Amino acid sequence: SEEEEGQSLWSSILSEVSTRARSK
Amino acid sequence: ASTSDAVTFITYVQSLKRKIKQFEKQVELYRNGQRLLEKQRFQFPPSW
């Protein structure tokens, strides 16, 4: 569904940005 | 070469000398901010 698709897309984008920030 | 240009260069040097303390304060603020944003995990904005 496009609903969960957009939710997971925002989730994946946030995950990628955070993981880039989470090099540590 | 001109007297006015030499005075302008001297004024720029004096402004840099006066702003050296402000630049050191900004450097300390930048170091503290980098440490804080790293520790808290406050991720920078993508366009930021």
Binding site: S1, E2, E3, E4, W10, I13 | -
Partner: protein
């Protein structure tokens, strides 16, 4: 980031419906029944952390529900304001000038 999530989601009604559908699906995906799902000789004690994390995922779903509630309150207020302005115009100085 909540602000980033809201900015990406925007004020499109289809966006709000999609956010609601996805959040409902995700919240339904957290049916915590078995806690100590120990896969091997060493018991992986994911139980209490996973139960509290599912409570936190539902808490994030409730926070998203509240944020979408505020967004839909703003959107419904805007739609009702526009429709009521049109109705007030029709009541005071109707289209038949």
């Amino acid at each position: 980031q909540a602000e980033n999530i809201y900015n990406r989601l925007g004020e499109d009604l289809n966006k709000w419906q999609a956010l609601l559908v996805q959040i409902r699906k995700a919240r339904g995906t957290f049916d915590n029944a078995e806690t100590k799902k120990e896969f091997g000789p060493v018991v992986i004690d994911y139980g209490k952390v996973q139960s509290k994390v599912n409570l936190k995922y539902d808490s994030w779903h409730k926070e998203v529900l509240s944020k979408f509630g505020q967004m839909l309150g703003s959107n419904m207020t805007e739609f009702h304001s526009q429709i009521s302005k049109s109705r007030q115009e029709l009541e005071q100085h109707s289209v038949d000038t």
